[PDB]
Amino acid sequence: SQFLLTRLNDPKMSETERQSMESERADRSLFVQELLLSTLVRE
Amino acid sequence: HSWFYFLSEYLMIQQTPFVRRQVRKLLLFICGSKEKYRQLRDLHTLDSHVRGIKKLLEEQGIFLRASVVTASSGSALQYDTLISLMEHLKACAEIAAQRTINWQKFCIKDDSVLYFLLQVSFLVDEGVSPVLLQLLSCALCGSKVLAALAASQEDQLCTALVNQLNKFADKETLIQFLRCFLLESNSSSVRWQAHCLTLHIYRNSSKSQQELLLDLMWSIWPELPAYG
Incomplete structure (x- = not known):
């Protein structure tokens, strides 16, 4: 614990921040699904 | 006050247990209260211990002329000399561990103490290093910070002591201290x-002092490969 630099990681997020992250993740998942489906279309 | 000095000297002088008890009771009654009596007794004891340490060091040819401790002989101290130094050193260490506030007060009164101790440590042997470091940390880092690491007025005293140390110290001295105690330290x-x-x-340092310290550290950084 003597290493002071070890405690560098200090991340935090608001509840609104968590909700926004969830919405962005949902949008990203939808875009990924659409892209993957496009990869399997009929030529 | 002269009576106080004589009473402190008598307390240091060997006497009967009843005599010591009577002298302690008289000093406590005369000198206001237990707090003031203990502070004065500790101040006298620390002054005596420091005087003896300085006398011993001068006897070994190490003389601090005005602020620079110089010695002509390159050889180290004898085992008996080291034991004698460590005696008063441990005494003072116990005293400071008792009341770091009193130790800080003594250091503030005797501004020539801290820098002299640091200079002496740079020339002292490896064994004495832990005690000197403990004393310096108790003085500067303070009792609360030291206790926390073990897991206001004192803060002001620490800040003033840091300012005094910065005033007394020189760049080369700081560089040597850092090199010896942080890169050369085997333990x-x-x-x-x-x-x-x-x-x-660094926490209590001044802004420009912090800049100077960072510059010195980044300068030393080039040689890091040797220290392993």
């Missing part, structure tokens, strides 16, 4: 203690 406990002391000093 890991010594390394951790040095890290704690340096962090405390």
Whole structure:
């Protein structure tokens, strides 16, 4: 614990921040699904 | 006050247990209260111990002329000399561990103490290093920070002591202290203690002092490969 630099990681997020992250993740998942489906279309 | 000095000297002088008890009771009654009596007794004891340490060091040819401790002989001290130094050193260490506030007050009164101790440590042997480091950390890092690492007015005293040390110290002295105690220190406990002391000093340091310290550290950084 003597290493002071070890405690560098200090991340935090608001509840609104968590909700926004969830919405962005949902949008990203939808875009990924659409892209993957496009990869399997009929030529 | 002269009576107080004589009573402190008598307390230091060997006497009967009843005589010592009577002298302690008289000093406590005369000198206001237990707090003031203990402070005065500790001040006298620390002054005597420091005077003896300085006398011994001068006897070994190490003389601090005005602020620079110079010695002509390159050889180290004898084992008996080291034991004698460590005696008063441990006494003062116990005293400071008792009441770091009193130790800080004594240091404030005797501004020639801290820099002299640091200079002496740079020339002292490896064994004495832990005690000197503990004393310096107690003085500067303070009792609260030291206790926390073990897991207001004192803060002001620490800040003033840091200012005094900055005033007394020189750049080359700081460089040598950092090099010896942080890169040359074979012991890991010594390394951790040095890290704690340096962090405390930087915390209470001035802005321009902090800039100078960072410059010195980044300068030393080029030679890091040798220290392993």
